[PDB]
Amino acid sequence: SSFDAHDLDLDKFPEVVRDRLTQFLDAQELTIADIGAPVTDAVAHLRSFVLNGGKRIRPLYAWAGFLAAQGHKNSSEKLESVLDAAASLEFIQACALIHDDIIDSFGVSVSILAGDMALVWAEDMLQDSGLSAEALARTRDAWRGMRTEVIGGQLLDIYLESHANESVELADSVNRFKTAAYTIARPLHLGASIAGGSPQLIDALLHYGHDIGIAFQLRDDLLGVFGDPAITGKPAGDDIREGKRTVLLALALQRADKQSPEAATAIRAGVGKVTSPEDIAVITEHIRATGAEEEVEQRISQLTESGLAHLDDVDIPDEVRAQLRALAIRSTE
Amino acid sequence: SSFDAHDLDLDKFPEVVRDRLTQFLDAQELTIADIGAPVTDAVAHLRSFVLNGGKRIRPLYAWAGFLAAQGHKNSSEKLESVLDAAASLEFIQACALIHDDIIDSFGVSVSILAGDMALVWAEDMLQDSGLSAEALARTRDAWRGMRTEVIGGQLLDIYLESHANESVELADSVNRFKTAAYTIARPLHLGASIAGGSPQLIDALLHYGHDIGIAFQLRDDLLGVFGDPAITGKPAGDDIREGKRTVLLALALQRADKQSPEAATAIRAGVGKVTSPEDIAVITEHIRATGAEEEVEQRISQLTESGLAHLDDVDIPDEVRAQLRALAIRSTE
C-alpha cells in the first residue's frame, strides 16, 4: 500500500482495488466455513468473479472525487478506509452483473443468492471500512442516491425490453440513472463527500459525471453494435442479438420509418430475435443506413465537451483535473 | 405513535411496524417518480407486498431485545429511530421471500430487482433511522452476522435440495443459520446492541434465540406436512410437493431404510416430484409411520425448555421476560 496518496494514477489503481477486495474476501472465510462447505464453494465462485476481472472504473471515480475535494491538504480519514469505501463499489457491481446475467437469460438459484451476498458485503465493506462516524454520515446522500438510482434505472430498462418500447426519452432516462448516476456521478459524489468537499465542488463533479456518464453509455451502445470482439469481449453485435433498447436503436427506428418501411420492419422483426452473424450484420447495416450512428456520435461529442467544461468551474488540483479529463476521453472517445 | 415505550405488546406491535414502513415507502415516492412511471409501478407492487402481510416477528424480537437491555431506565436514542431500526428487518425479509419465490419456481426480472430494492432500502432504513453514530456502531456485529448468516443458510439449503441430500447434520446447519440466527437470535442481538446491552444479557438472548429459533423451524416443518391450510396458508403438504430438505424428512428416511425399503423408496421417489393431494398424503403417511414426527416433537420440547431457561440467567424486566416466554411458546408450541 505504498502508492502516491495525493495523485491519481489511472493505470495502477485497479491493482490497489484488487488488494482491498482480496483482504475483505479473506476475512469472510472463517464465518462462511462455520456455515458449511457448499457455502465456501459458492463464495469461492463469487471471489473469482470479483477478483479476476473488471476495469474498476467506479472505485477509480470515487478515488478521484476524494482527491478532487481533498485538494493540496490532508483529510483526517485513514487511507485504507478511503480505499475500502472506494473498493466496496465492486461488490455492488458484482451483484448488478450477476443479477443482470439471470435477467438477460440451480445455477440461477446460486446466482441470485451470490449476488445478494455481494450486495450485503458492499454495505459491510463501507460500514466496516474504519471511516469515522462523521465521514460515514457524509456518505449518505451519494450512497443512498446511487443504489436507488441504479436499481430504478434497471427496472426502467427491463420495462423497455419487455414492452419492446421505442421511446428515445425513456432510453435517455435509463442512461441517466442506470449508467451515469451509477458509474460516474455518484462515485465522484461519494469520494468527494468522504473528503468533506464543498457543495460547489460536488456540483461540478456531479455535472461532469452526468454528461460523461451518458456519453460513456452511448459509446458503449455503439461498440455493442459496431465494435470488434477484441475491444468489447463479446461477439460482434451482441446488443442486436440481446435486444437492448438503446438510444441508437430508438433513433434508427424513428428515421427508418421515414426512409424505408422495409428496413424499419426488418429492424423491428430482427432485434432480440436473430442469432446468426449474417442476420445480425444485415440488421446492423440497416441501422447504419438510417444515419442514427452519426446522430449518436454528435451527442457523444457534445456531452464530452460540456462534461469537461464543468471541471473548469471550480478549483481542482492540476493533476486530478488532468486525470479526470483523460478518464472522460478514454470513456467516451 | 402513542404506545407504551417500556412494555412489550405482542399483538399490537405489528401495527406500529406497518406505520414505520408506510412512512419510509411514502418518502421514496418522489425519487422513484423522477426515474419513471414503470419504476413507480414496480415499487407499488413491492409496497403492497411489504405492507399487506407478515407477522413482523423479526422487528418484534428486535424490539424485545431493546426492551430487555434498556431495563427500567431510559436509552438516549429517539424512540422513532429504534422502531425504524426494528422495522427495517421487514425489508430484508421482503427480499428473502421475493428471491426465495424465484428460487422455488419478465416477472422474474422485476422480482429479482424488486428484491434488490428491498435489500438496499433495509440498509437505508437502518442507516437513516436517526440512531446516533454510537448506536449505529453498536449494531455492526448483529447486523453483519445476520445478513451473512441468512444468505449463507439459504445457500446451504439450495445445495441440499439440488443434491437431494439426506444429512440430518446439514439440515441442522440450515436451521441454525437460515432460521434461528436470522429470525430470532440476531434480531434480539440487534435490539440489545442498540440499547447498549451488556455481554451477559446479549449472551442469554442469543442462547434463547438459538434454541427457540431452531424449535420454530422444526414446528414450521411439521406444519408444512401435517398442518391444515387454515393454519399454514398453503395447500396441505406443500413441503412434500416442494421437496424441502427438512430434519423431519432426513430422520424419516434414516428410519424407513431400517423399517420398510418399499416405504423409503416411495418417499424418495415422491418428494419434490408428486403433485396430487392423494400422492402427497400417501408419502405423508409413510413419513408418519416411521416415528420421525415424534422424534421432531421431542427435539422441539427439549429446545423450548432450554431456550426459556436461558432467560433466567440474567436480569430482565418482568414484563419483557413474560412476553419472551409467551413469544417462544406461540412460536414452537
User: Annotated binding site for Mg(2+): which residue ranges of A?
Assistant: 100, 104, 157
Residues of B in contact with A32 (CB under 8 A): 148, 152
Give the closest-approach CA distance of B242 to chain A in angstroms: 14
| Residue A151 C-alpha, separation from nearest chain B C-alpha, in angstroms | 6
- In order, the DSSP letters of B180-240 are IIIIIIHHHHHHHHHTT--HHHHHHHHHHHHHHHHHHHHHHHHHHHHS-HHHHSS-TTHHH
- Give the helix/strand (H/E) hosting B294: helix B292-310
Tell me the CATH number at A247: 1.10.600.10
Among A192, A145, A228, A226, CA closest to A311: A192
Distance CA(A224)–CA(A234), nearest Å, equals 8
Phi-psi region of B54 (alpha: psi -120 to 50; beta: other; left: phi over 0): left
Residue B100 marked ligand-binding: yes
Distance (Å) from the C-alpha of residue B146 to the closest C-alpha of chain A? 10
Name the 3-class secondary structure at B103. Answer: helix
Q: Which residue of A has its CA nearest to B42?
A: A155
Those residues whose C-beta lies under 8 Å from the C-beta of residue B120, and which sit 6 or more positions away, are A119, A147, A148, A151
In whole angstroms, give the CA distance from residue A108 to residue A258. 43
Do the Cβ atoms of B155 and A110 come within 8 Å? yes
SS (H, E, C) chain A: CCCCCCCCCCCCHHHHHHHHHHHHHHHHHHHHHHHCHHHHHHHHHHHHHHHCCCCCHHHHHHHHHHHHHHCCCCCCCCHHHHHHHHHHHHHHHHHHHHHHHHHCCCHHHHHHHHHHHHHHHHHHHHHCCCCCHHHHHHCHHHHHHHHHHHHHHHHHHHHHHHCCCCCHHHHHHHHHHHHHHHHHHHHHHHHHHHCCCCHHHHHHHHHHHHHHHHHHHHHHHHHHHHCCHHHHCCCCCHHHHCCCCCHHHHHHHHHHHHHCHHHHHHHHHHCCCCCCHHHHHHHHHHHHHCCHHHHHHHHHHHHHHHHHHHHHHCCCCHHHHHHHHHHHHHHHC
Of the candidates A124, A140, A155, the beta carbon closest to that of B144 is on A124
Dump the DSSP string for B4-68. Answer: -TTS--TTTHHHHHHHHHHHHHHHHHHHHHHH-HHHHHHHHHHHHHHHS----HHHHHHHHHHHH
CB–CB contact B155 A106 (8 Å) = no
**How many angstroms separate the CA atoms of B99 and B159, rounded?**
16
| Domain with A177 in it | 1-333
Looking at the 3D structure of chain A, how many domains does it have? 1
φ and ψ at B176, to 5 degrees? -60, -40
- Tally A–B CB contacts below 8 A: 147
Rounded to a whole number of angstroms, the distance from the CA of B151 to the nearest CA of chain A is 6
Euclidean distance between CA atoms B150 and B185, whole angstroms? 12
Mutation site for A-interface testing, chosen from B40, B149, B155 by largest number of A Cβ within 10 Å: B155
Which of chain B's residues have a Cβ under 8 Å away from the Cβ of A103?
106, 108-109, 112-113
Geometric angle at alpha carbon A202, from A200 and A207, rounded to 5°: 100
Nearest-Cα residue of chain A relative to residue B163: A106
Which SS3 state, helix, strand or coil, does residue B113 take?
A: helix
Q: In B25-34, which positions are buried (b, 16+ CB within 10 angstroms) versus exposed (e)?
A: beebeeebee
In the numeric block, the cell 427457540 is attached to B212
Which cell goes with B281?
398424503
User: Among all residues of chain B, which has the CA nearest to that of A102?
Assistant: B109
Residues of chain B in contact with residue A117, where contact means CB-CB under 8 angstroms, are 148, 151-152, 155
Task: Tell me which chain B residue has its CA closest to the CA of residue A117.
Answer: B151
B228 known member of a binding site? no
**Residue B294, C-alpha cell as written in the block:** 415424534
| Inter-chain residue contact B110 with A144, CB threshold 8 Å | no
How far apart are the C-alpha atoms of A46 and A63, rounded to whole Å?
24
A238: which residues sit within 8 A by CB, 6+ positions away? A224, A232
Tell me the shortest Cα–Cα distance from A153 to chain B, in angstroms. 7
